[PDB]
């Protein structure tokens, strides 16, 4: 898609564009990709329904000279219905390369389940020494360092994922863990 | 069953260890930062408590250390020198003689 270059009517298709999210906790491409297929095939339906109502030199006005039954044919024909198979499949193959990267982003995914306050109030529960406190820091700066290690941005197809808008989710859980240990720390530095 | 620990030297009956052993993890626990003054206090405050632990010679003595070596008068009956494997302290109870 970015290859090719479009008119007017069709300014919203060109090197398509969509936002990536969490849709419930899940890494999702916010509008649907079969929605965005079928807005290519949208995109396609006002081709073809142009393109099957023309005006050729047989059709000439409203088809009176001759009908546009070769249109139809041709709608029926290869180019068009099977074609939609290949269409349908690199699309479905697409959505496998993004649950690729989705298998191997669910350890990273990790950090919603750590954010409940009662896994930080477990180990809270040890009274662990300050060593223990920044291993905990070093252990959410590593993840840090993946959440920045989101270069996988290939175009999913005729694709694009907002990367960013991912990045950006991860960082703001990591900082919740900071912020809970700030409380109790700050509380023994105010005291001392 | 007890919390994990090693006997380096025990001589009393073993359920004044039992009790001995119980409170002194929750303590350790209770009392994750500080000094180790707070837990001879706390602990000697506790185990001078029960009507158990009834004779005694001279009183209480309780101390905490990581590196060290004593020589002790100890009353014959009560003496107990111990671990606790999380923290590694090694922790030393007894009656004056």
């Given at each position: 898609?970015?290859?090719?270059?479009?008119?007017?009517?069709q300014?919203?298709?060109?090197?398509?564009?969509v936002?990536v999210?969490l849709?419930?906790?899940?890494?999702?491409?916010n509008?649907s990709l079969?929605?965005?297929?079928?807005?290519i095939n949208?995109?396609?339906?006002?081709?073809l329904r142009?393109?099957?109502?023309?005006?050729?030199?047989?059709q000439?006005?409203?088809?009176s000279?001759?009908?546009?039954?070769?249109?139809?044919?041709?709608?029926?024909?290869?180019?068009i219905?099977?074609v939609?198979?290949?269409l349908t499949g690199?699309?479905?193959?697409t959505?496998?390369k993004?649950?690729?990267?989705?298998?191997?982003?669910?350890?990273?995914?990790?950090?919603?389940?750590?954010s409940?306050?009662?896994s930080?109030?477990?180990?809270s529960?040890?009274?662990?020494?300050?060593?223990?406190?920044?291993?905990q820091l070093?252990?959410?700066?590593?993840?840090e360092?993946?959440?920045?290690?989101?270069?996988?941005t290939?175009?999913?197809?005729a694709?694009?994922l907002?990367?960013?808008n991912?990045?950006?989710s991860l960082?703001?859980?990591?900082?919740?863990?900071?912020?809970?240990?700030?409380?109790?720390l700050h509380?023994?530095?105010?005291?001392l | 069953?007890?919390?994990?620990?090693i006997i380096?030297?025990?001589?009393?009956?073993q359920?004044?260890?039992?009790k001995?052993?119980?409170?002194?993890?929750?303590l350790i626990?209770?009392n994750?930062?500080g000094?180790?003054?707070?837990?001879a206090?706390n602990?000697?405050?506790?185990?001078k408590?029960?009507?158990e632990?009834?004779?005694?010679?001279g009183?209480?003595?309780?101390?905490?250390?990581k590196?060290?070596?004593?020589?002790?008068?100890?009353?014959?009956?009560?003496?107990?020198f111990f671990?606790?494997?999380?923290?590694?302290?090694?922790?030393?109870?007894?009656?004056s003689?």
């Open positions: 898609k970015k290859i090719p270059g479009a008119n007017t009517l300014n919203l298709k060109p090197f398509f564009q936002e999210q849709n419930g906790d899940k890494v999702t491409l509008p079969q929605e965005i297929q079928k807005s949208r995109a396609a339906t006002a081709v142009c393109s099957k109502h023309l005006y050729n030199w047989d000439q006005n409203k088809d000279t001759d009908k546009a039954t070769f249109y139809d044919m041709i709608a029926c024909d290869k180019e219905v099977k939609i198979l290949l690199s699309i479905q193959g959505k496998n993004v649950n690729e990267f989705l298998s191997g982003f669910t350890k990273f995914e990790w950090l919603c389940k750590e409940i306050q009662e930080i109030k477990k180990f529960k040890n009274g662990p020494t300050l060593q223990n406190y920044e291993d070093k252990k959410f700066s590593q993840i360092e993946e959440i920045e290690k989101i270069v996988p290939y175009k999913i197809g694709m694009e907002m990367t960013h991912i990045c950006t960082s703001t859980w990591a900082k919740e863990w900071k912020l809970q240990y700030s409380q109790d509380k023994r530095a105010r005291q | 069953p007890l919390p994990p620990h380096r030297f025990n001589d009393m009956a359920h004044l260890l039992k001995v052993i119980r409170q002194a993890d929750v626990k209770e994750p930062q000094l180790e003054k707070d837990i206090l602990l000697v405050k506790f185990v408590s029960q009507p632990f009834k004779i005694g010679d009183e209480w003595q309780c101390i905490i250390g590196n060290f070596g004593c020589s002790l008068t100890f009353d014959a009956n009560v003496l107990a671990d606790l494997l999380p923290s590694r302290k090694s922790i030393l109870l007894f009656k003689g």
